[model samples]
Target: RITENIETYVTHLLSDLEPVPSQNQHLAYGYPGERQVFKDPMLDGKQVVVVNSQYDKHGRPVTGQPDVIQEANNYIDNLVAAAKSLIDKDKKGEKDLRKNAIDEMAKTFKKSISETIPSDKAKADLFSSKKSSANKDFLEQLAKVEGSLQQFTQAVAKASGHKLKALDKEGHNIRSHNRDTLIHRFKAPNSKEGEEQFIMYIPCGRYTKRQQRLMGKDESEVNRDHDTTSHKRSDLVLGNSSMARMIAGTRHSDGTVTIHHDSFSGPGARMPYSDFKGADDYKKLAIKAVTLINQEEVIQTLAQRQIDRMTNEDLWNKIPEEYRPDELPPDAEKARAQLIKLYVEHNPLSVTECYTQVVTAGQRVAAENQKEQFEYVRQMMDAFDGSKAKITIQTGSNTEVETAVGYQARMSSWGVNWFRQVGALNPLSDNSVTKNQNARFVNQMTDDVIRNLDKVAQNLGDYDKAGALHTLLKGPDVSDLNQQITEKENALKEVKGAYREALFSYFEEYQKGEGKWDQAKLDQLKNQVDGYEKSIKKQESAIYELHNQIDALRKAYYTEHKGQINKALQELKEQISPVIQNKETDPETKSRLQHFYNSCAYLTQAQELYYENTWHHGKNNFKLQTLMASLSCELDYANTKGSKSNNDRGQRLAQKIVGNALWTAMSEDGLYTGEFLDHRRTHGKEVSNVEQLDRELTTIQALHHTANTGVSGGKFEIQDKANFADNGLFGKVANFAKI
Candidate 1:
């Protein structure tokens, strides 16, 4: 689809180069009437039509124009006439007749242009400096010359359009039966477009079942390969014969004609490149358009990113200063730097220096003025046009949104295909169904967590809320999402264990601590567990995925029923409050949320009630301390759960620092209780990677201080925290609830 857009744009622009033919007869200049009978068909009389016996009284054949045929034949008959005439004058050296031949050729070209320049009296008067009256023959001849000249001009314009279209660097070439193909065949006709006038007039019945089947638009079959919102159905109509084939005139035997519809600047009101602001503006636009098409060099640099994802600096250094597109119309060094910078931005190789080098290399390869370099870039763009190597990037992380999103489509497909291909190719002898089952359960629990997040977006009233909603709907996690599969791995391991036991049990009983048992008999039981676990896990994982998918559906819900979430939340708070007051529900008992209202109330009001304005002015600051500690614990859990490795201690510390900072803002001082403090000191303190984390925490403190001061920090605005939550967290959660 990406490639097709680029190609279609080029095709349309190229088609516009030809001038439109006027419908009015008066608009056309004096020209030959469809047939140029004055021109001789055969230059040699002796070859086939010498037939002196069949000639008219003037010694010319009756079949063709006598004067035109005689003139052409005279040239052939006197092949060395100019040289001979020159030789005749050589003794006197007065005149070189060859020079006269040059003059004659020039005159013929001029005559053709003059005749072709249209029939408007003003235009004719501009060119015709001399005229004769007694004989009208000269005027008639001039008309024929004019027609030929018009034909030649059209040809030149047509060729120029083709050249420009072919030069696009961003390969946007897709083979489809759309405007692209239609524009390729657009042209003007040689004759007066009469009653039979039309672009590509073909017999309706020409498109048969075979063609329909190939195009996949036949009614008989269903297309499962494409989604509902994907590419347009291909119901291509094969063009008919009478189309004005090119800029030059060519007639078909069938009474029909085809001109490129592109000549009309498409079906809408928008004009072509010619109508862009003004002439000067349009030229700059053309240059910009061409430059965009040539941006494949930047895209190609991204491929190098895959080699090493960790060494970010390596990539940055690779880019020279010149190619970096920080500014346009780059000087030598700047151009190189710009190209490299763009490559890094596009292809996020972790190593900055390496990414830079890769980008530089790609630019060199793509923009190489050498013949080999030029061809290489052309081939790459061409391959891109053909969908051989489509480039895509991660737009966002919304697992519930499905696999076929704009940028997510290719990446998701690639990941799934890769996993399947690997699994299929290698039938591991040690398969573990138990591990897979464990992973399934974990996936179910986390999916529920994700669903819970939807409640946040469901109740948003800010711009960030809407924007965050958009972000969360982009795609599934491409990286962190690996946890979903990992959690189910335990069941897979159990299955593999059983299989190993079963396969080995044929000879003897498998031994245990209590007694020696039949290896074969024990293996049989294990095998049963393995087979069932393997089968069950596959089905179970799908159910788990669906359960989590509520996170996605909430977005759709918000799209339609946005106001309902708050209403539902109000009702839920009212209902739950009664239960809480009367002790109808236990502290650990989770509530049932049947609608968006219940979910919203439970998240906002119910949670808030548990956190009221308790004072801490006196010695009995117990409640306040407890609340602060509770907040700390919640912040700790969220941070720990979100990260995968111990190395992310800095990340956890940052979260702690941020939460504490926020708590301090809410309270007169930042303090906590002994219960929560004891837990962290006893167990959590031992889990330290603080050497690495201390530096990060120091930075966090600096930023925190700056935030409090309201200036002088990289990321310190207090509003930013609120904004981030409003957009990133609250919006995502709220939208998920809607879905």
Candidate 2:
């Protein structure tokens, strides 16, 4: 059922991309065959024809009617001519010319359309609504015929590329990843996207024994491999020069259609980039419309990111400062525009593409030369004629999944990863079952939590209440926070004070040396000052970070206490004694909650103990990690009494707690190994390098934190704190409940 939900979604998603053709046209035209021919738009001495093919209710072809072939009789003749025109008697690549020829055919077909189609019909309403309606009918008909030509034209190209592609070997150059690709018009996400806007439907958790692996270890590798969300998704980017967006006619001119390009400035209604409002939505639509069909470099960068995940690199840091991702590099806008020109010259029908930026400062009147192209493409996509291209990312065959079969990669018009980052992937998205499944499950989980827990549920008024408490109280121990703030402020003060002496005092020893007056000494002095300057900035940066933390903590806790909590806790303390004595319903629930409260208070101090004084210094380090591990263990122990950790997932997590301390700490930086081995603390015989000793200590600390007892009980204790009632406040809750 979940599977059907996904398939139905892809059908509708494809339908939305090329609506009439997929749904209504499939039903109307496919159920009953249709055909047409045009006399005016001739292609290579052959009449232009349309063959509306057949398909069934599920949208799959009925006996393959809509294929590049139909009615073997004339399709051969026309198909031959279509193939022949490009593969003409000349210098085209032996087989590669199939694409060049198909492209040549498609481009000329598009050029013929562009030549006659009026660029704008805005004034047609006044001058020739009736006569213009005839052209509109012609334009609309041309659009449909255009699709047929592409589907047929596309097959011709595929026949060229799919030569060995069909044989299947996974690699980079020719035989690449055996992933499905969309016959994409524009944007498509892959485990990320690819060349030609090609996207892959990376099987997130869907694979059982992926076909790609030669073979898994007897029974081992099935679930272990490919489970992570790393290969789950992929990026697009920019453009400049293309044929002028429009042409104008003048009464006294030498000729009509000699027009200047239109930049964004001429189109006045849209919001400016820096505007206080609408920039976001406008930019969104602006980008969506200006599709980057084969923006190679942009797609290449996305691949870099995808590859970055594999190799672990950061181009942001790797690249020189002059060229960052979004910033315009020198003449970069023009460079992008040139790339656009290269692509446009291919005459990609409706997709010239927004491929791949600018600048000036005062006295920067290279002004007249400032007549730009990037701005032109932006508005071109944002405004009238340019905004009219239909986007469709028809899916291709991804035999990897049952849902992706016979998916539309292309025929005429068309078109077209992550679990962690994205919980859903519907090649229909917005209303898709996969997306809705994600939505439903999330809503299910939220509703579940919000339903049973009192403080967890919210009335509209509780938002401010919850946020106020979270703002301050959501942190490590308050004392730790306070200590951090104090330490940073002290560091900040000393750094600033030290700067006064750093420039000169460090040089004082050399100041009186005979050779100190040399250029080398002066140069070394300058270097020290520069080093001092950087430290001061570093200290100030850390100080402000601490200040923000303390400010949020104070603002949050102080206000809630002053406004409401002060009275509640005071009253809570007073009521506890009486409540402990009362046995109205049961004492356990009341006593347990009281015990829980005291546990929280104890855990807070536990974290700060032996902290703020020395190593790790209330900051991040060794036993702090120990504290973290124990806290998790407690939560794990606490959570799994049945299902809910305190209520559900708690103990369900113990596998990782012990495993991590052993594996992670041993091989890496922390744990019983005592990083630099304080040979001073233990007699020089702690067996620092021995695995047995280290493991023993690791186990000792692990058990110490998780099993050690601590307390903060309600005010009622047995008369000497002995011979207690059956009630008990276990140390487990204290370990688990702390901040």
Candidate 3:
């Protein structure tokens, strides 16, 4: 809603990491390039330098580290001196050092403030704490101080019409890139995957021939650009893939790295080719699949299956008395203990199991892993990369066919056999038909590799045989020659085994270890135990250190220096804010910009508050935003809209709501201020209003609500008339609507 009010986004040229040593030729700061100095382009002989200095992440005046603060102050002093010295360098009346003085002065403010303001980590710690009288007091104090900073930063960035990067006219994608590109430069060396890279996440089909065709290469050029050098030189590389690769090649002064992709085209490839006809078919099938899947009511029928009842409770219960915590009910207790002791356990669950018992539905979705009953959904996420799914899909078949029913059956059988059973594949269910297909596909793909491999092996064999015969005839060191031949044969065998092992490692691990005790399992379990121990130690240490930290923080909060820090934080908030308007712009433009600023401010606060309190919940919320954005973008694909039978007015409206919801959720979960409320009221409704928005919001708010007092989905949902895809978009949209 707030984003709808704004139309402009600001962009700052500042780097998240220190400027590259080579780029630091401008003399805009003191030290000239040490802890701080002006990287002057004019000062350089041949290099075109880009000057940089420390600034808060949000571009506020708050100092991050105490040591850094001192460095910044010194930089400011040196900057003043540099400005004074510049006049001497330009003795003639032709030159003016005014621009240099201005730039240096700006750096002085940026460096001094950046250090004083708390780092993101510090802010999070302050906001996320036990909700007590102490927490309330601390939060209130911090808020007031941060408020003042907002005004100060606004002044600094707005002065002389020098718009803050965030407060300028820019696209959502641009701001997204800036925020992502800058912060990531500090941590990630290769931004190809996490930062941004082309990936086609189609749920309907994964890694199949259909998928590659529907979602793989850009098709403009393929094998030719498969090489890295070829991709870098090609202009056809779409999305920010090319840009990201280019940025990845650059370096920062602190010896860090960066990548700046305009979009993720693919995994060292291009965006999937637009398969309009195939996509149309897929959508129809997807609708049908979802409809059929959800059509039947999940019957939760309790079965009286009698087993070795070690306790009073039934054997059907998962947790037996021994397995249950001491405090739970008798019926709820001892389920797992009794089941395990009796060996009457259902190793892997299915949709049927979910219906029969109160088992987790998500777990049921993943219950087909016979090798390991992944009770939680997260476990099955890597099934594709793991041997569990890979062996079934990749080993023997092309996985490129359009047999929808066969594919579904494969997935289902996989649940029953390979994935669930962790044994041999069924001739009918497994890649029996697909094996020949896969072999043919592979043979075609890496034919050159296979040919080369065979040729080399044949040559080696011939040479060895010839040498052996020659050695026997010559009667020279025959024993040594035999030993050498034996060694060579053994080495070649080992190499072949290693090659096979590399290919089958994913499947091999599971077959060789316990369900949850493979090498990965051992490593993970060790890490978990280690983490628990570390956490206990950390808590103890925090208790001891917290007192001093709390005291110092209190002093800083109320001290004059603290006010300066607050100003710096506020400034940062504004600087980080995407500027969507200009002073010379119309009232509507100005109103929108103000709205965006307020939205960003509140959103940041809300995010800090939530994550500081509930870690997983906050993370899930973030994931939801990302998912929604992806889906929305998918719908927005240029080709997709053209294929629709109806006009996209409603779809566009839906996009607004979905996009706004995600943007709002990502920004700060709608942490509004009085100013924000006023802005919204003034703006009225533009678009983005929806019922689903209300539902999602309710889900989030219910997390902290007391009993029935807090908001929930029940309050949001007015009827059981859920939307069905077959029923049409309007009804379907209504059924799943959330705010």
Candidate 4:
């Protein structure tokens, strides 16, 4: 409200000049002694002009216009009279009454004090009396009002062309530009080519209550009680203008950094010319300031665009806790980038695309495995049929078509016969059939008889020999060989017993000295014993050979027929392998498997959405960067607090700061022509009036970088909505104090 009133007063004060076109506006300020008015260009290099006036030590403008001074003095006299009148008035001690009285006193004094004589005691006497509690309370209010008056007076004087002269008295001390050079350089916002173009520059200064507090000074001490220029300089001062509002930062001689800003149009919100001289050099400074501000915006614009280029999977990675699907699959990383991209870009595709693709792929994988399982089963069946095994039907005919289930049933029947539970298959349920029947059948048939097939075949006469000789020597029939081995063994054992006994008898007779122990007789008996021993050795060797021959025959028979046996067993196992595999797969049928299938379709669409979303944001960011870089200036803001940090978060913060500065310029573009108030009403929770709405609207506008135009005299407003997407990740970060 105060700013509005000030603008109104300034507008009327400069009534002699026509309202300058918005686009051509600029601002300039300094001491009034020499070059007070500087021909300059602001952001975007618009034309600007300046004027000079007399000022006091405090930079309070002094007026030479007699009639204006007289009017100001007359208003002061009335204000003094009003204060004097209040001293004698009877009050009921109501808080509102006292407040209103103080407010009125301050307002009147602010407007009129510049024309009146300075007398501290005369001003102090109105509330100095403390005869009662009400009197004391009134004094407190009076003090506050006095402070308000003091601050407001200086501000008003500054606005009204006040200037301060430098003590140095050097040429550089009086900063100004030539009026002649500026005349042609000025331009109205709507100025046509070759026309007398004009530009308006409004001087501005910085004010900070917090800094004032930091100085350990009360409101009254700020101006009236200050002793030296340093104390006054502590007020955090700067120029106020269209350019100043858009960009704010200070380069101190001591190298300390201080920066702050408000965008131009909606809220708390320069000059130029080409000279026949070096005004171009001065315009370059404006370019530097504008470019720095623009760079801040560029940072976020680029970041948002980068985010837009992400796949849903990438976006989801950034905020996995928020948008991640309930059950992520193996391919979630890729899918997440796709999802996030879709979500932020406002693309037509949904984020579900990522999940859908995976689900469908899983189905395909499972189906492929199923086909392998089918082929394996078919091979096993072929092996079984090739093994000379037959699957008999209930009709007593062998089943030539060997279906897996039918084969399994035949195998099961072979084992079930001994259990006397022959009817088990008939009464059993389908699900239990395989468990009750095949579990045992497989255990019995798998490898039980493959190695012993020759013995089994011979025993059953399945490989019966027709010729007598073949029959005698056939399959594992070792009985004939066993008999021959037994006979030879018995003969060898008898011969050995006879020779051992003969030697023992001959030794006993010779020792007994019977019939003259003759050498010829001894030699003859010894030779007889040696002959029997040799014959026994021959018979024992023949028996050992016979044993080897029988074992060889059995091994040879088995080797010749093992192929059929193994083939049959392998076929049965192959048939049962897939069925067993299905048993493992059954549990997953309706839950994970089903869900995966559904997700395949859903996520496929979602992925496309993600990409589109990413692209949308990327496009905006690219445009912003291009626009800012196009301006002629150094964007090396690294030395400033906004960009000095080295980390990513720090960089992001710097960019936001720069963006705020640029926003100041954007506000003046009249982008928020009409619906700003409505938008504030909906989105700005703290806003309660037009001024508050306007202030917040600037914040929203800067964050989203959105603008709208409409029919002349029609309602206009911002086109884009303020959101996490449009505003970059961090937006409108400043705190707004209630006025």
Off by over 4 Å in 3: 1-204, 208-579, 583-603, 614-739
lDDT of each: 0.25, 0.25, 0.24, 0.26
Stretches off by above 4 angstroms in model 4 are 1-14, 17-185, 188-201, 220-228, 232-243, 246-739
Better of 1 and 3 by TM-score: 3
Which of 3 and 4 is ahead in TM-score? 3
After the best TM-score superposition of candidate 4, give how far the Cα of residue 712 lies from its true spot, in angstroms: 40
Q: Name model 1 segments beyond 4 Å from true.
A: 1-346, 349-407, 410-563, 566-739
lDDT agreement of model 2 with the native: 0.25
Candidate 1 lDDT, tens digit per residue, 1-739? 1111222222233222322232311111111221111111211110100110122363222221112211211222122222333334344443444445434544565554445433342111101112423113433443453344334323322322222222111011110111111111211112233321112111001122222233234623221111111323221111111111111111233433222111100011101221233444223322222222222222322222222121223434565655544544435334323333354454433210000000011122222222212222222222222122222322111100001111100000000001111222354211132223222322332333345455444554332433333243332453344454445533444543343334223212221211655545555655564465456447446644643443344334334443444454344444444543454545433222222222222222211221222121122122222222223222111111111111121122233333332222222111211221122211121222221121122222211111111111122111112111111111111111111
Instruction: Tell me the lDDT of candidate 1.
Output: 0.25
- Give the count of colliding residue pairs in each prediction: 106, 26, 82, 55
TM-score of 2: 0.17
- Each candidate structure's TM-score, on Cα atoms with residue i matched to residue i, is 0.18, 0.17, 0.19, 0.16
Query: Which window of ten consecutive residues has the lowest lDDT sum in model 1?
Result: 408-417
Q: Model 1 residue 124 lDDT?
A: 16
Between prediction 1 and prediction 2, which has the larger lDDT?
2
